Amino acid sequence: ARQVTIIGAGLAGTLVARLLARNGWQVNLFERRPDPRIETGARGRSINLALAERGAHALRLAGLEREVLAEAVMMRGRMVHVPGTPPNLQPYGRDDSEVIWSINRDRLNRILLDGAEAAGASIHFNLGLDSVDFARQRLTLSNVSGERLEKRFHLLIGADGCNSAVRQAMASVVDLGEHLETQPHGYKELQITPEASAQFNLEPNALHIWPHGDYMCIALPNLDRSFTVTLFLHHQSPAAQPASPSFAQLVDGHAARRFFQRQFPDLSPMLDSLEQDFEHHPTGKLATLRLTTWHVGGQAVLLGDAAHPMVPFHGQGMNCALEDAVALAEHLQSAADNASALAAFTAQRQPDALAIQAMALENYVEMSSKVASPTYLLERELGQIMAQRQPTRFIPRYSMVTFSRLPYAQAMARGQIQEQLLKFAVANHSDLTSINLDAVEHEVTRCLPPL
């Protein structure tokens, strides 16, 4: 039996443990945190994630999809809150079967843990990886108090998150070629209670966005009708724009409140504990981390956030993580040896991780400044016409990322061609009446191969 050691019982680590264990691998999975299935007196505060086709299909192959969806809230469309008009629901894709699911992270983790153990994996909690010795094939683990334990390993999978100890240990034996790109936006999570969302008739079965240019709020629903609101806002004000809103200017809850009443006046009444949340929840940091290589020979490979931290603006990090786990399990299961498997995995997935990293950055502009401009409206309306006349050629980029399993690089490449097609068609035209539709359709057929 082939043996594998996995660091991190997060989303990618637990899924890959399930897929390998049920193929007969001996799987040991080590996790720094305690087991979240052991109930304690602490008050767990878990956020929700948007689960889409790529994540859903990976769970479907694992036999876990139905269990996960039982606990998920359907989001049928995007509820855009633009000042001056009523909130406007934009359906996802073309028909009612194209939805995103809002799923609690801790519930998903528990389901995945149960699934890995049922497939035969052994999960060891309260053991955090501290270092690796690649030449002696040993690693050092330790509990919180610092007491250390050594284990031999044969194949090591670093599924240990954006601050991966495995990636750090790989920097001893190979150049990963890391480039960290910081992001000027931080984020803060605020809460809407069920009473407040019910009192203000906030739609539960939708994803809600409050665009506002260089800042914005997003809200995902929970099963109990509460919402978690995420404010994205610059850490610091730029020197050129010294009065522009930023976190540094929101020192306490009362400034926060005046900000929301002025700039989000229909959302402010719903955030009852805006003051308290603002001061006791930490401001989070966003960053994109790109690696030229993900593995060391046949000994160790990264996946998930350990491999490609990305900004959350597409809701694709977990979706990408689950899709990585599927691909890593398939390559390991079928390769001549572990070395060939890890090379072929990195070669397949690294271009795709780059593509989704780039699309997540760009999607910030789409969500916060594009959805409210006159020019983008005309293009989106021409885009839906094109999807109807050429359905296998013109597939909107958001739809290819979110509702298909087209490799992310091909989605990006086709999206760039569509974007420039729509951009030139609508330029110097104010209405849809002055646009030659068959001209645009002819460029779809000349430039977009059918799927």
Ligand X SMILES: Cc1cc2nc3c(=O)[nH]c(=O)nc-3n(C[C@H](O)[C@H](O)[C@H](O)COP(=O)(O)OP(=O)(O)OC[C@H]3O[C@@H](n4cnc5c(N)ncnc54)[C@H](O)[C@@H]3O)c2cc1C
Ligand Y SMILES: O=C(Cc1nn[nH]n1)c1ccc(C2CCCCC2)cc1
> Dihedral sign, CA of 159, 162, 164, 170?
positive
Q: Is 319 annotated as a binding residue?
A: yes
Contact 127, 141 (CB under 8 A): yes
Q: Is 187 annotated as a binding residue?
A: no
- In angstroms, give the least distance from the CB of 324 to ligand X: 8
Using CB under 6 A, which of the segments 205-213, 315-323, 353-361, 385-393 binds ligand X? Answer: 315-323
- Contact with Cl ion (CB under 5 A): which of 158, 245, 309, 312? 312
Query: How far apart are alpha carbons 49 and 122 in whole angstroms?
Result: 26
Query: How far apart are alpha carbons 346 and 376 in whole angstroms?
Result: 36
- Contact with ligand Y (CB under 6 A): which of 313, 394, 403, 408? 313
Based on the shown chain and the rule CB under 5 A, indicate whether residue 317 belongs to the binding site for Cl ion.
yes
**DSSP-derived secondary structure for 290-357:** E-S--EETTTEEE-GGGT----GGGS-HHHHHHHHHHHHHHHHHHSSSHHHHHHHHHHHHHHHHHHHH
What's the one-letter identity of residue 147? E
Contacts of ligand Y in 144-183 (CB under 6 A): none
Structure tokens at 251: 């020192």
Q: Where do the DSSP E strands lie in 110-178? A: 122-124, 128-133, 138-142, 148-152, 156-158
Q: Is 170 annotated as a binding residue?
A: no
Based on the shown chain and the rule CB under 6 A, indicate whether residue 221 belongs to the binding site for ligand X.
no
Based on the shown chain and the rule CB under 6 A, indicate whether residue 50 belongs to the binding site for ligand X.
yes
Contacts of ligand Y in 380-419 (CB under 6 A): 398, 402
- In angstroms, give the least distance from the CB of 181 to ligand Y: 18
Contacts of ligand X in 279-308 (CB under 6 A): 304-306
What's the one-letter identity of residue 126? N
Residue at token pair 């191969």: 449
Based on the shown chain and the rule CB under 6 A, indicate whether residue 78 belongs to the binding site for ligand Y.
yes
Q: Is 52 annotated as a binding residue?
A: no
Query: How far apart are alpha carbons 445 and 420 in whole angstroms?
Result: 14
Contacts of ligand X in 181-200 (CB under 6 A): 187
Q: Is 305 annotated as a binding residue?
A: yes
> Dihedral sign, CA of 419, 420, 425, 426?
positive
**Closer to ligand X at the Cβ: 29 or 395?**
29
Q: Is 22 annotated as a binding residue?
A: no
Binding site as annotated, residues for FAD: 11-12, 31-33, 50, 105, 129, 305, 318-319
Which positions lie near ligand X, rule CB under 6 A? 7-13, 30-33, 49-50, 128-129, 159-161, 165, 187, 304-306, 312, 315-319, 321
Which positions lie near ligand Y, rule CB under 6 A? 50, 78, 100, 207, 218, 220, 230, 312-315, 363, 367, 398, 402
Binding site as annotated, residues: 11-12, 31-33, 50, 78, 92, 105, 129, 305, 318-319, 363, 398
